[PDB]
A paper describes a structure:
Here, a simple protein crystallization method inside the features of the HARE serial crystallography chips is reported that circumvents batch crystallization and allows the direct transfer of canonical vapor-diffusion conditions to in-chip crystallization. Based on conventional hanging-drop vapor-diffusion experiments, the crystallization solution is distributed into the wells of the HARE chip and equilibrated against a reservoir with mother liquor. Using this simple method, high-quality microcrystals were generated with sufficient density for the structure determination of four different proteins. Additionally, structure determination from intracellular crystals grown in insect cells cultured directly in the features of the HARE chips is demonstrated.
To this end, we investigated an aggregation-prone, deamidation variant of the highly soluble human eye lens protein γS-crystallin. The deamidation variant of γS-crystallin used in this study is an extreme example of naturally occurring, age-related deamidation and is implicated in cataract formation. This variant has a total of nine substitutions of amide-containing amino acids to carboxylic acid-containing amino acids. Via conventional sparse-matrix screens, we identified a crystallization condition for this novel variant and then optimized it for higher nucleation rates. We found suitable hanging-drop vapor-diffusion crystallization to be achievable at a protein concentration of 11 mg ml−1. In-chip crystal growth was observed in our custom crystallization trays after one day of incubation at 25°C. Notably, the total amount of protein consumed to fill a chip was only 55 µg, demonstrating that this method is suitable to directly transfer hanging-drop vapor-diffusion crystallization conditions to the chip format without high sample consumption. The γS-crystallin deamidation variant structure reported here crystallizes in space group P212121. The mutated sites appear to play a significant role in the crystallization of this deamidated variant.
Author numbering:
A (entry chain A), B (entry chain B): 5 to 178
Amino acid sequence: GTKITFYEDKDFEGRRYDCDCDCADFHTYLSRCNSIKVEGGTWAVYERPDFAGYMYILPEGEYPEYERWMGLNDRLSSCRAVHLPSGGEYKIQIFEKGDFSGEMYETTEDCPSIMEEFHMREIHSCKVLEGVWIFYELPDYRGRQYLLDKKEYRKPIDWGAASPAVQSFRRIVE
Amino acid sequence: GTKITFYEDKDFEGRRYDCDCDCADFHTYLSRCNSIKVEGGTWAVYERPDFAGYMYILPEGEYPEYERWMGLNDRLSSCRAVHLPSGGEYKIQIFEKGDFSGEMYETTEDCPSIMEEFHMREIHSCKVLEGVWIFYELPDYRGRQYLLDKKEYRKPIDWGAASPAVQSFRRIVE
């Protein structure tokens, strides 16, 4: 029901590789990627194989250039589809310090600035109770991205960040 | 990395349809299915589209007839890949009555007979804490099957049963 399309050159030119499911490594099929077409659903694309490296969240739409997904280079070699749970419920707990410690807040809302709403410059642990969320490195959903499926996150490395630099977050809705 | 293959006739004869991901409806491509070949991983196949109707769990291997997966007919039209968490932990809570009520036991092991091990003839609710499990209608892992890839089951209908008929269960391990 879903599919994503990669192109080597800008504005949907050049060789192409299709994926309708979670592709773990296609760097042997594409030397680079400068255009992306998403047909159904929301995908997460990773720089390096096995869902590692930098990641980006691309909902249904067209992306003629690599800046349209706030990308930093034309290197992408893995991708996975984002299954959204049914029920409409979104709920997350964020903690000041590691292992679900420190002062904790719970919210069901997008937060464009954590420093202003919760007075925290960093986040070291997290519990995703309902739905799927994205952590952004900078406020107003700019900077590096990190996907958070559900389960629990004890350290910032568990969602893919070296530093605990997280300043905004929001939910994925289709 | 995984794929499943359906055949219309026995012994891998007839027309063929491949699926590499979660296929929600392929009854228009195959009128019937009598043979199945699974390449890597464990799949769940459903009688009717949109993952409804009777279900069966087929791990990696070959199934020349439809009795090899304890099937009751050659009618299958949807299938899902079963994603196992890489944590090795399997843990389940079973409850006598609905809404996580009644006498409750917790185990991490397969149970070929619930009546003898826990003194229960039925199970009306369930909490899956770690891993993925299968409920079987009869003891010793025979009869109708039910997949449990979630977390919370308040009623027997939530795992796909009209009746609370559960008499054995075991974990899916690859």
